[PDB]
């Protein structure tokens, strides 16, 4: 609720901007660095005192004439070096390590544009990507092997864009334009078995190529949540939040109130709707919102550059006491929003290559 | 407004409880969030993280681009040189899909849809509190005005009490279950009969009420009837009991479970006489007191018919040239058009002969072994008796639509060594499913294609274009989507059904089109299911890419497949 | 080859449809499963096969039949088989011999 736009920046490339992420995998006293991807440019910045934001290393995709769409920070346990993977219209994964100056791990095999990059909370070696081919293929980066693929034949007949790990990396919730609300359990005994051999497979040991599993059965699915294009969903602990073109915010849980997510069956079809934080003037899809590290502070952008901020305190959608911030200059189109690893600093990015930084009056 | 308020409140009793409930689970979520976030944050503390490093100038790349990131605020504009990213190839766009080899057949508006019956129960609460003013007061708000006169309707509507539910209304448990009731023979078989589909002789054939009524009869006197006193206490060992058995053509203290009596009812319909086989089938009871139980059963249940037939025809008078003449009669009637390909349908002729009213005759098709037409039906395919192998022009199978039946092409080894991959015939690979080993690689003409690892000859089997069974109307609707997306994984199976390969299929769906391709496509007809076989026009060697003609219009050809990649030599 | 008589996902696809039906008890519902699974395992087409296949099946999982207590339910399945004229008289006899 207590926030103000302290810094504002703008890329000179004037290109529409895309996903921005913050280095949550950090340490106390580490530089407060966040990253940004444009059409073919990838860049990072560090927030500083007095609203200062010094520019950091920025690379350019001078070869692939395609628009980057998603990016996410990465960690390596071997070198303790942070990394970051990116993808876009061509759907090829580039994961750059800033320390080594370049990217060495290349991932191809997906079809149309990749529209999701987001790593497992526990293993940094695991990254499941979502693209326009309806594929939930996951890559074991450290081993450079394909991992078990979800969805497929029984999955989404339409494109998928939104996917989320829960806090423990227990289950993966996902949905796309299909309006199908499907999740798959990571804790499925079969896949850890594949996961275990995935971490130690070597094609040089035996001719037998790796056998990734294919999965076509969610723990649950539904389509009664939205009659319009759902564009954002996130793991709200045991609940599931959602965003759609209809300018309505709906969190929900499967089945009835007493129905646990892990106890539920794929055959279930009941849903418990509980979210009512509706908004307006953001009818276009492809929007993406973000959450704080502690799952406390919620902020939403808008097509008209306005801010739609909420909290996860005793404040509940029973009355929806909103805090709708707005900046006069920031009004063109908010593409992506991202919290820092705190409730004080937030980075807001407009479509017109411009970046707006808001800080809390804590 | 007290009655109106209570109607508002009565609804609100559930509503604020939900408000209490959502808050209650919210705290449970929050503590779990605090549990999980703190636990995760602990490892974040442990993992040392390398701080960021700033860019440095490159002497060998002094010509790289430089971007001056503007600052919207008073902060100075900051510049940094650019770095070229990695160069990687591209794979042509495709959609996720899964293998298979058989075939397969195949918003968000409003809330709660209706006036909830919960309010009716709340109205019932307004009824149970119960002079005439009360009846009118109940009548005041609800559309079903609950006056004492209309309270009678309320009670009648309350007579429903509970829905029967989705379960077998009759007590028909598994016969292995101890609670298996004395279900009669047909009711027990009813579940299996509905689920079973003899077309593929499987239960719930998801590729095929379209089932036989099995109301037929068959000879039962094939048993040897080798009576012998082999069971100490049997149908034998008692001359009076054994002689009394001849008349049909008191048990001991032993008793029989209700489940046993059910399968006792089942067993008689199989042999009608073989009480000895009952002893070996179920070890709980000896033939005696089961033979005697059947004596009791024969006295209770009406005796079985046990009728045998021979049919007036014995032999001859059935030359296959008449069949061809019968086929000639059908051919000249409507098969002259050769455009209206109707998929096979099992015709039912319980009493009527194979008259011109036979659905296959109307569908200009031959009856099959599954048809309810008798074994003398003058439409069924005779066979594939060619001595060398059912593969060439002379053979009726290869000329006709019929892939040679496993039970009919007796000379071409159709039934023989079905497990063995190699066989004399070349018109039963689709029956066996013996494909080739196709390859996937980005086709040079356009996007993906299908390659072959080995040489293959002309006029021989290639992998079958399997897919999904779908009707024309949905095919155009889905095709309209694919037509918008230029995709054409649709195939004109027959005039009555279409097969589509976008979502579900096998590898060969990526085969590209050519106007003079080395490989062709011909619909075949096998085992009652039309399919489309693929065969190479000419001799092929290792590594050649596969092509086949789509048979589209020339306008559609340039609309879709306008690339051919071959000029004239002179 | 990346392909066989029966791709995996179909198996999980069909068994889910198996549990969809309500009027079939679980004891008589499981007998549906393993029967159809072995059929698609080998892809029989002709009458000669199923007479041999049942003997192949009964030895393949006859011990498993004991554990799941579907021996008697499977007998009714075999009874339906002869009703379909698809099985012979003595084939019923040999099944019990392998069964016990
Ligand atoms: N010879 C040809 N020239 C141009 N387009 C063709 C073609 N043969 C097939 N196509 C198109 O390809 C579509 C099938 S999808 C296969 C396309 C391509 N092989 C790829 O993998 O990307 C059809 O809709 C058809 O319109």
């Amino acid at each position: 609720y207590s926030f103000k736009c302290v810094n504002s920046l703008k890329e000179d490339h004037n290109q529409p901007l895309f996903g921005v992420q913050f280095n949550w995998h950090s340490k106390e006293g580490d530089p407060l660095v966040f990253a940004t991807v444009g059409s073919n440019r990838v860049t990072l910045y560090e927030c500083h005192s007095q609203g200062e934001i010094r520019l950091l290393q920025s690379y350019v995709d001078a070869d692939a004439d395609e628009n980057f769409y998603t990016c996410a920070w990465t960690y390596d346990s071997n070198t303790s070096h942070p990394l970051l993977a990116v993808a876009g219209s061509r759907g090829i994964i580039r994961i750059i390590n800033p320390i080594t100056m370049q990217c060495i791990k290349h991932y191809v095999g997906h079809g149309n544009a990749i529209n999701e990059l987001k790593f497992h909370p526990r293993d940094p070696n695991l990254l499941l990507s979502v693209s326009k081919d309806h594929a939930l293929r996951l890559w074991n980066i450290q081993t450079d092997t394909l991992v078990a693929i979800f969805g497929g034949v029984e999955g989404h007949r339409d494109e998928v864009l939104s996917a989320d790990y829960d806090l423990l990396g227990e289950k993966i919730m996902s949905c796309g334009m299909d309006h199908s609300l499907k999740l798959w359990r990571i804790n499925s005994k079969r896949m850890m078995n594949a996961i275990k051999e995935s971490y130690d497979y070597n094609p040089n040991k035996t001719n037998r190529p790796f056998i990734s599993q294919k999965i076509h059965f969610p723990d649950f699915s539904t389509r009664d949540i939205h009659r319009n294009y759902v564009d954002c969903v996130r793991w709200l602990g045991d609940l599931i939040l959602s965003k759609s073109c209809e300018n309505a915010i709906v969190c929900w849980k499967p089945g009835k109130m007493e129905d646990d997510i892990d106890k539920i069956k794929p055959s279930e079809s009941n849903v418990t709707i509980l979210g009512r934080f509706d908004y307006s003037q953001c009818d276009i899809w492809y929007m993406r919102f973000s959450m704080d590290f502690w799952q406390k502070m919620l902020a939403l952008g808008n097509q008209v550059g306005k801010l739609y901020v909420w909290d996860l305190e005793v404040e509940d959608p029973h009355k929806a006491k909103c805090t709708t911030l707005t900046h006069h200059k920031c009004g063109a189109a908010i593409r992506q929003t991202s919290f820092s690893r705190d409730s004080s600093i937030l980075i807001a990015v407009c479509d017109d290559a411009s970046i707006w930084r808001w800080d809390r009056l804590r | 407004k007290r009655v109106k308020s209570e109607y508002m409140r009565l609804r609100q009793l559930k509503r604020f409880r939900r408000a209490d409930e959502v808050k209650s689970m919210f705290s449970s979520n929050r503590q779990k969030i605090l549990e999980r976030t703190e636990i995760l944050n602990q490892e974040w503390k442990q993992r040392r993280i390398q701080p960021v490093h700033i860019l440095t100038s490159v002497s060998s790349l002094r010509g790289t681009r430089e971007c001056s990131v503007t600052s919207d605020l008073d902060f100075p504009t900051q510049v940094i040189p650019l770095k070229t990213l990695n160069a990687v190839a591209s794979v042509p766009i495709m959609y996720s899909w899964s293998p298979l080899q058989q075939n397969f057949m195949v918003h968000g508006d409003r809330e709660c849809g209706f006036i909830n019956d919960e309010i009716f129960v709340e109205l019932v609460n307004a009824l149970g509190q119960y002079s005439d003013k009360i009846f009118e007061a109940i009548s005041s708000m609800f559309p079903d005005k609950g006056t004492a006169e209309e309270l009678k309707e309320k009670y009648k509507e309350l007579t429903e009490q509970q829905l029967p539910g989705a379960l077998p209304p009759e007590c028909t448990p598994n016969i292995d279950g101890p609670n298996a009731k004395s279900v009669q023979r047909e009711q027990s078989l009813h579940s299996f009969h509905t689920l079973f589909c003899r077309r593929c002789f499987k239960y719930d054939c998801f590729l095929h009420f379209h089932a036989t009524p099995n109301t037929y009869k068959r000879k039962n006197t094939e048993t040897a009837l080798d009576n012998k006193p082999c069971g100490p206490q049997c149908y034998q060992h008692l001359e009076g009991a054994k002689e009394f058995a001849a008349a049909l053509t008191p048990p001991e203290n032993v008793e029989w479970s209700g489940a046993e009596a059910s399968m006792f009812r089942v067993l008689i319909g199989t042999y009608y006489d073989n009480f000895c086989a009952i002893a070996r089938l179920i070890g709980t009871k000896t033939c005696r007191q089961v033979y005697e139980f059947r004596v009791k059963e024969s006295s209770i249940i009406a005796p079985a018919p046990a009728e045998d037939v021979d049919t007036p025809p014995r032999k001859k008078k059935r030359k296959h040239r008449l069949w061809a003449a019968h086929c000639r009669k059908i051919q000249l009637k409507k098969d002259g058009s050769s455009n209206h390909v109707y998929n096979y349908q099992p015709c039912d002729h319980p009493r009527q002969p194979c008259d011109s009213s036979c659905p296959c005759v109307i569908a200009q098709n031959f009856c099959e072994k599954f048809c309810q037409c008798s074994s003398e039906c003058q439409n069924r395919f005779p066979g594939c008796r060619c001595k060398a192998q059912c593969n060439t022009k002379q053979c009726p199978c290869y000329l006709a639509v019929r892939e040679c039946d496993p039970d009919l092409c007796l000379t071409c080894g159709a039934a023989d060594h079905w497990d063995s991959k190699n066989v004399s015939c070349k018109n039963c690979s689709i029956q066996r499913g013996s494909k080739k080993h196709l390859l996937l690689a980005p086709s040079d003409v356009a996007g993906w294609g299908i390659f072959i690892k080995d040489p293959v000859q002309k006029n021989e089997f290639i992998s079958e274009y399997c897919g999904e069974i779908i009707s024309q109307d949905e095919a155009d609707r889905r095709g309209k989507v694919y037509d918008k997306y230029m995709c054409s994984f649709l195939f004109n199976l027959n005039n009555d059904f279409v097969v589509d390969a976008t979502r579900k299929g096998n590898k060969i769906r990526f085969a590209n089109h050519s106007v003079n391709p080395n490989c062709y496509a011909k619909v075949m007809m096998v085992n009652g299911d039309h399919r489309i076989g693929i065969f190479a026009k000419r001799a092929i060697q290792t590594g050649e890419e596969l092509f086949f003609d789509y048979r589209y219009s020339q306008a559609d050809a340039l609309k879709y497949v306008g690339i051919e990649r071959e000029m004239e030599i002179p | 080859s990346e392909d066989e008589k029966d791709p995996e996902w179909l198996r999980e696809k069909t068994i889910t449809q198996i549990e969809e039906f309500s009027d079939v008890n679980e004891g008589e519902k499981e007998v549906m499963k393993l029967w159809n699974l072995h059929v698609m395992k080998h892809g029989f087409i002709a009458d000669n096969q199923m007479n041999h296949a049942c003997m192949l099946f009964v030895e393949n999982y006859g011990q498993k039949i004991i554990k799941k207590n579907l021996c008697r339910n499977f007998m009714l399945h075999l009874v339906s088989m002869h009703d379909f004229n698809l099985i012979s008289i003595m084939s019923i006899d040999k099944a019990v011999t392998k069964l016990r």
Side-chain angles (χ1 to χ4, degrees), chain A residues 1-361, chain B, chain C:
Chain A
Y1 53 98
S2 182
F3 286 117
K4 74 176 182 299
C5 201
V6 189
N7 179 283
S8 182
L9 298 180
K10 176 175 178 172
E11 185 91 346
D12 55 336
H13 203 192
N14 189 359
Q15 300 309 298
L17 294 186
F18 303 92
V20 297
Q21 291 296 342
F22 196 89
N23 187 27
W24 280 14
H25 317 305
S26 59
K27 284 275 282 171
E28 184 60 279
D30 287 2
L32 280 296
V33 179
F34 65 97
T36 301
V37 296
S39 175
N40 63 342
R41 299 185 172 188
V42 293
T43 178
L44 307 96
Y45 316 87
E46 184 186 346
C47 292
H48 287 277
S49 62
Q50 310 294 340
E52 206 284 320
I53 298 184
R54 64 181 183 117
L55 171 60
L56 313 179
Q57 294 192 49
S58 310
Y59 298 171
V60 62
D61 196 346
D63 186 42
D65 301 331
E66 63 93 4
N67 303 116
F68 287 143
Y69 289 155
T70 45
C71 69
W73 290 76
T74 302
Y75 175 67
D76 168 37
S77 66
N78 298 114
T79 62
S80 184
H81 295 166
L83 281 80
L84 191 142
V86 70
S89 303
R90 274 167 86 267
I92 291 176
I93 297 89
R94 303 162 189 241
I95 171 168
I96 297 94
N97 187 352
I99 297 89
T100 190
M101 295 298 102
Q102 285 91 18
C103 169
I104 305 293
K105 308 297 186 177
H106 301 86
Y107 302 96
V108 75
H110 281 269
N112 203 339
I114 286 180
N115 58 8
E116 192 65 280
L117 286 180
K118 181 267 290 180
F119 297 79
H120 192 279
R122 267 68 177 283
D123 192 0
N125 315 329
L126 309 185
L127 171 65
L128 188 153
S129 165
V130 180
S131 57
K132 189 151 187 172
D133 62 353
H134 312 174
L136 272 65
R137 292 185 180 182
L138 188 154
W139 308 87
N140 193 321
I141 296 93
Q142 188 274 331
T143 72
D144 191 6
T145 191
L146 192 68
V147 193
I149 172 177
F150 291 167
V153 59
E154 208 266 330
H156 285 94
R157 311 144 75 110
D158 297 332
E159 182 178 9
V160 181
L161 78 166
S162 198
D164 195 10
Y165 287 112
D166 53 68
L167 314 179
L168 309 189
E170 176 196 343
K171 300 187 213 315
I172 306 167
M173 186 66 204
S174 167
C175 77
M177 183 278 288
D178 194 313
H179 314 86
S180 300
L181 278 298
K182 307 191 156 188
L183 73 165
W184 285 262
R185 281 176 178 103
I186 293 163
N187 285 85
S188 178
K189 279 76 67 180
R190 52 167 54 83
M191 62 80 71
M192 283 74 74
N193 303 160
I195 291 292
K196 295 324 156 281
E197 54 93 19
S198 76
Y199 190 69
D200 50 41
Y201 174 74
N202 182 359
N204 306 149
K205 299 297 288 185
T206 183
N207 78 301
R208 184 68 188 160
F210 186 94
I211 304 308
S212 168
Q213 178 165 195
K214 310 189 195 73
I215 296 95
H216 318 298
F217 292 100
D219 319 307
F220 175 79
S221 188
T222 183
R223 298 179 83 229
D224 201 48
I225 316 300
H226 308 281
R227 63 179 67 91
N228 209 337
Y229 286 179
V230 60
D231 58 353
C232 297
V233 294
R234 289 295 95 169
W235 269 99
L236 190 51
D238 203 85
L239 310 187
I240 315 292
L241 188 64
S242 71
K243 315 285 175 74
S244 175
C245 299
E246 62 181 311
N247 290 302
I249 293 187
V250 176
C251 200
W252 62 271
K253 72 168 300 307
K256 301 287 103 176
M257 181 304 297
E258 72 275 16
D259 303 341
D260 192 289
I261 57 169
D262 196 35
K263 87 173 200 176
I264 211 69
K265 302 196 301 286
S267 63
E268 180 52 80
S269 63
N270 288 274
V271 184
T272 296
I273 179 167
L274 60 93
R276 300 274 86 168
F277 294 105
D278 304 346
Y279 56 102
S280 190
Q281 73 259 11
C282 186
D283 58 354
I284 63 165
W285 50 278
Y286 203 79
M287 295 298 102
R288 285 298 191 124
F289 75 99
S290 180
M291 196 68 204
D292 71 310
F293 165 62
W294 299 292
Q295 189 65 250
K296 313 289 189 67
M297 295 298 102
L298 176 73
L300 175 69
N302 196 287
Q303 186 179 207
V304 305
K306 294 203 176 186
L307 310 185
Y308 277 86
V309 182
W310 289 276
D311 62 326
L312 306 190
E313 308 309 309
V314 301
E315 174 53 43
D316 275 308
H318 69 297
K319 283 181 181 179
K321 203 167 189 175
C322 307
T323 306
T324 311
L325 282 74
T326 293
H327 182 54
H328 62 290
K329 289 277 201 70
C330 175
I334 287 293
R335 275 272 189 193
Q336 307 285 288
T337 65
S338 294
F339 277 83
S340 57
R341 204 183 168 74
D342 54 80
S343 180
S344 69
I345 316 299
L346 188 149
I347 296 97
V349 166
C350 172
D351 187 70
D352 192 37
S354 66
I355 306 101
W356 313 80
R357 168 179 153 194
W358 296 62
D359 299 333
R360 170 174 284 261
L361 277 297
Chain B
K1 72 184 180 185
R2 65 106 176 169
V3 290
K4 292 197 175 184
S5 304
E6 293 312 315
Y7 182 83
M8 295 298 102
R9 299 306 315 154
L10 259 55
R11 175 178 181 183
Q12 196 76 5
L13 274 296
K14 285 86 67 185
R15 195 142 72 181
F16 74 76
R17 284 173 184 155
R18 286 143 42 191
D20 303 335
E21 284 151 24
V22 299
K23 291 270 173 172
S24 66
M25 50 173 185
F26 195 90
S27 64
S28 72
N29 300 142
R30 282 280 293 212
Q31 55 90 46
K32 182 153 71 178
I33 287 161
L34 268 298
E35 286 179 343
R36 294 180 168 197
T37 49
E38 286 160 14
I39 279 165
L40 266 293
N41 196 50
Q42 301 332 291
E43 298 95 14
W44 173 94
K45 298 170 185 178
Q46 312 321 303
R47 52 200 290 213
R48 278 82 65 193
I49 303 291
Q50 164 65 37
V52 67
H53 168 58
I54 202 56
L55 194 57
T56 183
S57 184
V58 193
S59 303
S60 298
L61 274 76
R62 290 183 179 112
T64 43
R65 324 271 60 73
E66 295 218 52
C67 63
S68 179
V69 186
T70 63
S71 171
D72 293 331
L73 297 198
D74 61 339
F75 284 104
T77 298
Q78 307 176 80
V79 71
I80 208 167
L82 280 73
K83 178 67 158 65
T84 299
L85 287 173
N86 49 290
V88 295
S90 191
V91 303
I93 304 172
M94 71 76 78
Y95 302 158
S96 182
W97 66 281
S98 69
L100 55 90
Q101 294 307 138
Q102 279 199 331
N103 282 165
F104 204 94
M105 42 195 178
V106 64
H107 173 263
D109 202 5
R110 313 299 147 99
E111 293 83 33
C112 187
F114 63 91
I115 303 296
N116 307 66
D117 197 65
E118 302 300 327
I119 306 294
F120 178 85
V121 175
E122 293 290 347
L123 186 78
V124 169
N125 307 330
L127 310 194
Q129 55 85 35
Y130 196 96
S131 179
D132 190 78
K133 274 68 172 180
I134 297 165
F135 307 139
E136 306 318 282
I138 297 157
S139 301
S140 62
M141 73 291 291
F142 211 61
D144 274 16
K145 38 173 58 70
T147 185
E149 288 72 29
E150 205 272 333
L151 292 200
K152 310 184 183 183
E153 307 300 315
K154 299 289 94 176
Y155 207 94
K156 290 184 290 187
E157 297 154 32
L158 280 158
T159 57
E160 316 291 340
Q161 297 199 141
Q162 186 174 1
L163 197 72
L167 57 88
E170 291 84 5
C171 183
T172 63
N174 46 310
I175 201 62
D176 271 297
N179 50 354
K181 212 173 181 282
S182 187
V183 188
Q184 67 186 327
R185 177 178 199 266
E186 58 264 59
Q187 281 181 347
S188 54
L189 295 176
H190 166 73
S191 67
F192 288 168
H193 292 174
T194 55
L195 275 296
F196 187 70
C197 172
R198 210 186 189 279
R199 183 79 154 284
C200 198
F201 45 87
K202 306 188 305 187
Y203 296 102
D204 188 17
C205 280
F206 44 76
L207 73 164
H208 300 315
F209 187 61
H210 44 283
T212 177
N214 68 74
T215 50
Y216 78 110
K217 67 177 180 289
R218 197 60 184 165
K219 195 208 307 181
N220 58 358
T221 45
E222 289 294 334
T223 178
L225 293 179
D226 298 331
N227 51 358
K228 59 179 70 70
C230 58
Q233 284 194 14
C234 203
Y235 55 88
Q236 286 272 23
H237 311 264
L238 277 185
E239 285 71 27
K242 188 59 180 72
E243 189 273 334
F244 174 62
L248 306 177
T249 73
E252 292 292 337
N253 191 62
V254 64
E255 284 289 343
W256 302 265
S257 176
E260 285 184 316
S262 177
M263 61 80 71
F264 291 164
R265 196 164 296 107
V266 168
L267 282 167
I268 182 166
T270 66
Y271 294 100
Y272 314 97
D273 285 329
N274 201 348
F275 321 116
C276 195
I278 311 309
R280 62 99 186 169
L281 279 155
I282 188 66
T284 63
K285 265 77 184 179
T286 306
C287 184
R288 194 170 297 299
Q289 303 100 31
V290 164
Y291 166 60
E292 284 75 10
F293 195 83
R294 266 72 175 161
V295 170
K296 300 286 102 176
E297 281 181 300
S298 66
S299 64
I300 290 159
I301 303 104
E307 291 292 342
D308 300 337
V309 293
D310 56 352
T311 70
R314 290 276 287 177
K315 51 185 178 180
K316 311 176 185 180
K317 308 182 184 178
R318 57 168 300 289
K319 181 67 179 178
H320 305 112
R321 296 158 171 239
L322 310 189
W323 295 80
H326 187 197
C327 297
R328 281 287 194 85
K329 293 170 186 181
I330 304 289
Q331 273 191 329
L332 277 296
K333 275 189 296 183
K334 286 298 300 183
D335 284 329
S337 72
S338 308
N339 287 165
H340 314 308
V341 185
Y342 311 92
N343 61 344
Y344 159 73
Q345 300 300 335
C347 62
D348 193 3
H349 295 244
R351 181 163 290 104
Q352 72 272 44
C354 308
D355 48 29
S356 300
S357 84
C358 186
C360 82
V361 176
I362 305 304
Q364 61 182 10
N365 210 2
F366 315 93
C367 280
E368 299 287 28
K369 59 174 69 168
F370 319 126
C371 283
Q372 308 327 292
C373 289
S374 80
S375 50
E376 296 72 49
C377 169
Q378 295 304 291
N379 207 2
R380 297 157 305 141
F381 210 82
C384 205
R385 215 175 309 101
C386 61
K387 186 139 286 189
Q389 66 280 325
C390 290
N391 66 2
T392 188
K393 207 69 176 182
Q394 70 187 6
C395 183
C397 294
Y398 185 82
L399 177 60
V401 298
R402 296 272 305 162
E403 183 276 348
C404 65
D405 186 274
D407 309 316
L408 277 297
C409 190
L410 304 182
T411 50
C412 76
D416 186 30
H417 62 83
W418 54 267
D419 51 353
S420 306
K421 321 304 168 197
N422 301 96
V423 73
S424 65
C425 184
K426 310 285 176 68
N427 194 20
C428 61
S429 46
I430 185 61
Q431 164 266 341
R432 276 149 169 80
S434 65
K435 71 186 74 65
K436 294 305 182 180
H437 201 155
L438 299 185
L439 275 74
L440 179 65
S443 63
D444 299 334
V445 172
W448 305 118
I450 290 298
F451 291 90
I452 187 72
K453 76 166 289 204
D454 49 340
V456 66
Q457 303 306 321
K458 48 151 283 190
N459 200 44
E460 65 164 314
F461 188 73
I462 320 292
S463 300
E464 204 273 336
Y465 195 96
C466 68
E468 174 74 50
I469 296 168
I470 189 53
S471 70
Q472 304 283 344
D473 54 296
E474 187 61 32
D476 296 322
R477 294 190 292 265
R478 292 177 65 189
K480 155 183 163 73
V481 182
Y482 318 133
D483 204 30
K484 293 192 290 290
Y485 297 121
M486 171 294 308
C487 201
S488 81
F489 279 8
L490 273 294
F491 196 103
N492 186 67
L493 192 146
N494 64 5
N495 188 83
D496 294 9
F497 281 99
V498 192
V499 67
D500 44 356
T502 303
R503 293 187 295 170
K504 298 170 70 176
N506 75 88
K507 325 192 182 176
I508 208 163
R509 81 189 195 167
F510 306 114
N512 202 276
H513 157 89
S514 166
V515 300
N516 42 32
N518 292 45
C519 167
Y520 65 82
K522 296 199 308 174
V523 190
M524 281 215 168
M525 160 55 197
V526 56
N527 206 39
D529 297 341
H530 292 305
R531 284 219 283 287
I532 61 171
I534 315 301
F535 319 85
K537 290 189 184 292
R538 77 202 73 158
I540 311 300
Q541 59 260 6
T542 301
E544 285 180 79
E545 171 67 10
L546 302 191
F547 316 86
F548 75 100
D549 187 0
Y550 290 176
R551 298 182 89 250
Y552 282 127
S553 172
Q554 187 162 10
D556 295 338
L558 273 300
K559 186 185 179 181
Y560 296 126
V561 296
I563 316 167
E564 197 271 331
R565 200 187 72 188
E566 202 268 329
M567 73 291 291
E568 313 94 320
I569 297 98
Chain C
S1 170
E2 293 179 24
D3 183 49
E4 67 271 20
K5 281 284 191 172
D6 171 40
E8 184 67 29
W9 64 267
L10 188 152
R11 316 162 76 262
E12 286 85 6
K13 163 79 156 56
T14 175
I15 178 172
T16 55
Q17 306 322 293
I18 289 178
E19 285 90 52
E20 178 271 336
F21 207 86
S22 57
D23 299 337
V24 164
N25 304 270
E26 293 84 4
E28 49 183 18
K29 188 183 288 184
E30 58 196 338
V31 307
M32 312 335 287
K33 300 192 306 173
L34 78 167
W35 177 258
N36 291 348
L37 184 63
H38 180 264
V39 168
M40 91 185 88
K41 179 59 168 68
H42 301 284
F44 317 103
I45 307 97
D47 305 63
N48 72 321
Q49 293 163 291
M50 71 205 158
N51 283 268
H52 169 277
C54 61
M55 281 315 78
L56 172 66
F57 189 95
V58 67
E59 56 88 17
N60 269 345
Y61 320 104
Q63 56 191 359
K64 303 201 68 185
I65 304 293
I66 302 177
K67 267 78 75 178
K68 309 296 183 178
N69 195 236
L70 73 164
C71 298
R72 185 177 178 180
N73 295 326
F74 194 80
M75 295 298 102
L76 183 64
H77 155 73
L78 300 180
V79 170
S80 310
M81 295 298 102
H82 198 280
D83 174 37
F84 309 148
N85 316 107
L86 67 86
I87 205 64
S88 63
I89 297 290
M90 71 275 288
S91 304
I92 320 172
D93 305 356
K94 296 186 298 183
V96 172
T97 67
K98 173 59 212 178
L99 182 70
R100 296 280 81 81

